[PDB]
Design a protein around this ligand. Structure first.
Ligand SMILES: CC(=O)N[C@H](CCCCNC(=O)CSCCNC(=O)CCNC(=O)[C@H](O)C(C)(C)COP(=O)(O)OP(=O)(O)OC[C@H]1O[C@@H](n2cnc3c(N)ncnc32)[C@H](O)[C@@H]1OP(=O)(O)O)C(N)=O
Ligand SMILES: CC(=O)N[C@H](CCCCNC(=O)CSCCNC(=O)CCNC(=O)[C@H](O)C(C)(C)COP(=O)(O)OP(=O)(O)OC[C@H]1O[C@@H](n2cnc3c(N)ncnc32)[C@H](O)[C@@H]1OP(=O)(O)O)C(N)=O
Ligand SMILES: [Zn+2]
Ligand SMILES: [Zn+2]
Ligand SMILES: [Zn+2]
Ligand SMILES: [Zn+2]
Ligand SMILES: [Zn+2]
Ligand SMILES: [Zn+2]
Ligand SMILES: [Zn+2]
Lengths: 563, 563
């Protein structure tokens, strides 16, 4: 019901238009309508379907042809966009248009906020990286050229010509079907699509606002979105967000971890700090099956179990930033209890761990990650797990372990840095008398005097079961030939962590998890959360997006159980 | 003297050569000598004046032709650049070489420190931009084509071709007459010159180690450089550096500022922190002379003083990092005491202010800057100065206020940030009862009810003297027509800080500096330090470089006073 008078707009908007005029000599190609004849370029109007310049925008602002502020922002970007679509990253017009937008990004935000809006940015989702289907490590970066069929199966232009002739094997994904598709049936594409961010309208104002900015979810507030401005003018606020990190069900594991982190934070008494919530959101019983090579060498002759049972758990840590939950750490673990046979007995394995670097304060981020991890080791140690195993291997270019689409400026560690990061955490744990000691897989195997692949712990998704299949094949049926060699080669990447050692490790009681099972398909393994994020445009790439993603993650965790 | 056994060099260096070999398929074009025939590229043996590859480097490392480890590092980088030059970054060959180099960067550093060297990086100083002579604001970027006479006068590609007639008038540079020079007598260069870092030999072991890495100065330790290892082999260490930041002569002002900062760090109790040393390294008395325009309008009239006397000071803050001094902040001020006629009477002005972002801990950096600023404003108040002035404006791209060549990842704030930065600093000083109030120049002029330009503080180098020249000139003789308008246009950038408000001004005691004069040509204004740095290749671009520059800066300060 809010009416905007054409003179209250120019009162607010014109300053930021003038600030674009005032840039000598950067605004020249924009000050008056582009005239293709007067610059000799007949291929202009055919490339720019609807053009814009500075005076056209000014005329509309002076006459009164802008109903609402976004129309003015939209034209301003239209003008920039045409200008980028013609010139290259190399010319002068481009450089100029960059400057104006750069200047405009600066002025528009306060002004738009003056008018009662969330911001003044034009916001879109940069094209995600896709999975090349040929190599299995192959990746498709933004702007690259790729081939799709039914928008499922995409191929990197290199991988695609590495195919035999014109017939492509495809859809080997679920079950038996080997549907064979011809090359002619594919779409040649550029991974360059830009989806805009969505707006939500205020049911009292009428103002378009960025969904992600105002954090409005249809499930949490089904009455409809009411902007802060309107809420303040009636001395009221939003309903409580019942779907919070804090209100996720508690478990002993979570309570233990968060107490540790929070106690740690208190002793620091650092001023930017806020309390950390830790929640276990998945817990289920699984079995890993020994693969066919190792099964035929060791299982069929009864030297090794055909499978090992383990519990898998997914846990996340959250912090309140600007009065809103943000998810900053995640981890999936595998726990092989006392009922599991050798050699996996009483071992825990960290499948995957991951983070988004928005924890406040930056100063204590690493230390908190170390605290959560050391705390996990301390928990399972008390219950009776004797040993922990960690495969320290950073994700490859544009892969994400748990959180879809990280911030562009959250550097990923190289192997050395990651290995030293783990050595630091474990050294801490060694000095608190929690971890007894640790060694790389090779020094450990020597220590334990092992002589056969069958003595190596065998975890779901780990590196060793795969290399053992190759070992047995390549060596003609042996299970020891290149074992110590392979262990040397990769040694500094494979941490083996002794929580309980010596004679003490032999006369221990049964391991009992006081926590109950927690079914939750969304976090059974890591692929579902990644898919959910890919599917719903969730990103962890900026604080505001991480906040919204977190908000959605929670709504999913809460509405999955209740039915 | 340490000749290396050829065996020492194989069992240390091969792991890094094998690491490059291990890269399938990224080392394929580098495995064999480039036989231009087999490929289909004729011009190889003319552009690459010497080819290099992994087979040849393997040959030498096995036959012991490598005398010292740096030859191996050169050949590795010989090979990389050869391939990096012949292709552009578009191709496949170039990308491959880039992965290779990153692998080598990751492998070589531990290996070289095992061989007793500082590091294994190949280091050079990237060219700095140069002043174009034509526009007098024109600039020559790295890699841009340009023209030069002697090594003094340079011209951008376009500027040079935009002087018609084929003769150039160089010699605006001195106050000596205007010579003229042919166009044939200029050199066509490219700005692609890279200077290697210098090495220093150890007088015992004989290894080349990077000067900047081991911080050896001919003047500090004139009995030759001895490496860290050789000192550790003799149960002895380097003679105490007598040219420290700490041993710079103290001042009552210096001591006041550092006592504030260090009390501040003690109260914070943050476990990363080092002590801060503030020293004033320049104090000279000067006078700013009213420029021609205003001189004619107001001075000859008898309405305002022809020139104002001020004291100028330069003060730097240092921190101990890895046991070495690092200069991290710098400020020049202009102090207009009680002997100074209006309107400048009892006003301080911050000429310039700069920083290098390596202060530990990061999370206290901004606070410490503020404590220094709030400390200065508190010191001048207690001395009897009523009013401080700050021209909040960040440096242009590629420009440096005080420290030459900043780190590439030290973001420079945009105006709205820098403005908010001074507000946070001031609000704290108002919280602390030190600053009474502060306002923008336009609101302050309105309160003081000013009516004429003769009433505005006239500071050396500040924005207003220049703009007042232009205003009188364009208005045809008027002293104050655009005045309030001009002040309004830039209000947000000119801070007016009131230290003593109201009645006090009428009869405060005279202002006396308890500190003596510190003559120091190097720190008289900002140009001499920038110039020294540009001349001696001093940079503040990394921790190691910034440390070396601090060492030289400190040597230069210590050896002007003494003869
Ligand atoms: C099947 C198969 O084949 N392969 C595999 C099998 C998978 C095995 C799974 N194994 C595991 O899951 C256990 S190890 C994996 C670790 N997880 C990740 O790495 C995910 C992404 N990384 C992160 O979330 C964080 O980086 C984290 C590792 C949590 C630590 O963050 P941090 O903040 O405590 O330290 P920092 O990151 O070094 O940064 C701390 C400082 O170092 C800086 N820094 C970091 N990296 C770099 C760099 N590369 N260059 C320069 N600086 C750099 C960073 O900027 C920063 O500065 P500051 O704090 O001053 O701002 C598969 N399934 O795909
Ligand atoms: C003649 C004429 O026409 N014109 C002029 C006339 C001269 C007038 C002279 N006036 C003055 O001397 C007074 S104005 C002060 C200007 N001095 C400088 O600007 C030197 C370069 N800048 C700095 O040394 C520092 O930035 C400093 C100003 C000390 C503040 O450092 P900081 O660290 O406390 O705050 P932060 O930098 O904002 O950073 C604080 C956070 O904000 C971040 N940040 C900073 N800038 C940006 C940015 N642009 N974009 C995004 N993020 C950004 C930064 O990375 C960071 O994150 P974190 O702490 O999590 O890492 C002439 N003569 O040429
Ligand atoms: Zn918004
Ligand atoms: Zn491909
Ligand atoms: Zn509203
Ligand atoms: Zn801190
Ligand atoms: Zn070095
Ligand atoms: Zn030029
Ligand atoms: Zn030596």
């Amino acid at each position: 019901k809010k009416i905007f008078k054409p003179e209250e707009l120019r009162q607010a908007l014109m300053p930021t238009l003038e600030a674009l005029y005032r840039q000598d000599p950067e605004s020249l190609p924009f000050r008056q309508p582009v005239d293709p004849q007067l610059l000799g370029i007949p291929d202009y109007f055919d490339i720019v379907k609807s053009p814009m310049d500075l005076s056209t925008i000014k005329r509309k602002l002076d006459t009164g042809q802008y109903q609402e502020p976004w129309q003015y922002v939209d034209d301003i970007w239209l003008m920039f966009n045409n200008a980028w679509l013609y010139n290259r990253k190399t010319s002068r017009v481009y450089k100029y248009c960059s400057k104006l937008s750069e200047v405009f990004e600066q002025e528009i935000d306060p002004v738009m906020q003056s008018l009662g809006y969330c911001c003044g940015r034009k916001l879109e989702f940069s094209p995600q990286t896709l999975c090349c289907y040929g190599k299995q490590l192959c990746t498709i970066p933004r702007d690259a050229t790729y081939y799709s069929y039914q928008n499922r199966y995409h191929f990197c232009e290199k991988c695609f010509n590495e195919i035999q002739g014109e017939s492509v094997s495809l859809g080997d994904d679920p079950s038996q079907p080997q549907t064979t598709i011809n090359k002619e049936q594919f779409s040649k594409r550029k991974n360059d699509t830009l989806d805009p961010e969505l707006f939500v309208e205020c049911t009292e104002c009428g103002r378009k606002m960025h969904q992600i900015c105002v954090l409005h979810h249809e499930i949490i507030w089904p009455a409809g979105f009411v902007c802060d401005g309107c809420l303040k003018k009636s001395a009221r606020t939003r309903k409580e967000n019942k779907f919070s990190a804090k209100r996720l069900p508690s478990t002993r594991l979570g309570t233990f971890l968060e107490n540790r982190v929070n106690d740690f934070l208190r002793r620091q008494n650092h001023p930017e700090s806020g309390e950390v919530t830790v929640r276990v959101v998945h817990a289920s019983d699984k079995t890993v099956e020994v693969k066919p090579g190792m099964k035929a060498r060791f299982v069929d002759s009864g030297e090794m179990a055909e499978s090992f049972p383990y519990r898998t758990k997914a846990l996340f840590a959250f912090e309140e930033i600007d009065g809103v939950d943000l998810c900053f750490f995640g981890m999936h673990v595998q726990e092989y209890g006392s009922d599991c046979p050798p050699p996996n007995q009483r071992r825990v394995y960290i499948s995957y761990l991951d983070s988004v670097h928005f924890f406040r304060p930056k100063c204590l981020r690493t230390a908190v990650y170390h605290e959560i991890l050391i705390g996990y080791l301390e928990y399972v140690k008390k219950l009776g797990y004797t040993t922990g195993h960690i495969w320290a291997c950073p994700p490859s270019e544009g892969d994400d372990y748990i959180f879809h689409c990280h911030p562009p400026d959250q550097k990923i560690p190289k192997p050395k840095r990651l290995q030293e990061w783990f050595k630091k955490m474990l050294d801490k744990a060694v000095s608190e008398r929690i971890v007894h000691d640790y060694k790389d897989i090779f020094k450990q195997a020597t220590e334990d005097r092992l002589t056969s692949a069958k003595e190596l712990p065998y975890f779901e998704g780990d590196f060793w079961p795969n290399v053992l299949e190759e070992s047995i094949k390549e060596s003609g049926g042996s299970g020891s030939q290149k074992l110590y060699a392979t262990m040397e080669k990769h040694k500094e990447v494979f941490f083996v962590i002794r929580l309980i050692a010596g004679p003490a490790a032999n006369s221990l009681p049964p391991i009992v998890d006081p926590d109950p099972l927690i079914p939750c398909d969304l976090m059974d393994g890591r692929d579902a959360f990644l898919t959910l994020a890919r599917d719903k445009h969730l990103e962890f790439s900026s604080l505001r997006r991480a906040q919204w993603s977190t908000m959605c993650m929670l709504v999913e965790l809460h509405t999955q159980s209740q039915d």
